[PDB]
Amino acid sequence: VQREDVETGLDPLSL
Amino acid sequence: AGHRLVLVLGDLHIPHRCNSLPAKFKKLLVPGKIQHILCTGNLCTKESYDYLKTLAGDVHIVRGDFDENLNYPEQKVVTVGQFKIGLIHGHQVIPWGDMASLALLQRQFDVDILISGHTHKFEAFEHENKFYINPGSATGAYNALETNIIPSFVLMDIQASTVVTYVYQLIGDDVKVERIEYKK
Ligand SMILES: C[As](C)(=O)[O-]
């Protein structure tokens, strides 16, 4: 289901 | 802030199968960011429970088939934000990770999100407006049926009636992050 990639440092654990 | 950050993980199999989480995972998981932890089980010992308590002061664990602590509940249903969430290790689901058995559980539990483990394989999908999450194994521990396991864990950002599911994976020697949106 709708699996989009996430740019470096945009996940909650990194800022 | 205003977001609820929920860590989802399990099947560490520490120390019998693995001694620790990947060093790069430990750098990401630091105190003071996560509100709740939902653990599918197979820690397998108090040291790992203790470690989880350093990451958040609201820790939920269900009993795996290799857990030492038999006081953990067999399954658990909790509410976070607008979402009702069900938690089961999954070795009770017959056959392993059948989508039909899981959907049965969802109706039995009456949850928006059904979390389970035991297969050591990350999955996150929507089936009949219901959301199903398997965090995989945060240590990459082998199991029966599979030995080449990608270490992973899930982070749920709950806000209003959207859940944003981040999946963290150690692929090669680096962390790769994907996201899946689910609406209530
Ligand atoms: C080993 As059991 C009671 O959690 O299926």
Residue numbers in the entry:
A (entry chain B): 1192 to 1206
B (entry chain A): 2 to 185
How is this structure described in the published paper?
Combining X-ray crystallography and in silico predictions with biochemical and cellular analysis, we reveal that Retromer directly associates and recruits the RAB10 regulators DENND4A, DENND4C, TBC1D1, and TBC1D4, and the RAB35 regulator TBC1D13 to regulate retrieval sub-domain function. In addition to its scaffolding roles in associating with cargo adaptors for the sequence-dependent recognition of cargo proteins and the WASH complex for aiding retrieval sub-domain organisation, Retromer should therefore also be viewed as a major endosomal hub for controlling the activation status and switching of specific RAB GTPases. The retrieval sub-domain therefore constitutes a hub for integrating cargo recycling with the regulated switching of selected RAB GTPases.
We determined the crystal structure of VPS29 in complex with the DENND4C 1203PL1204-containing peptide which completely validated the mode of association. ITC analysis of a PL-containing synthetic peptide from DENND4C established direct binding to recombinant VPS29 with an affinity (Kd) of 15.4 μM, that was blocked by mutation of the PL motif or by the addition of a competing VPS29-binding macrocyclic peptide RT-D1. While the observed binding of DENND4C to VPS29 is consistent with previous related crystal structures, a second binding site is also predicted between a short DENND4C α-helical stretch (residues 1232–1243) with α-helices towards the amino-termini of VPS35.
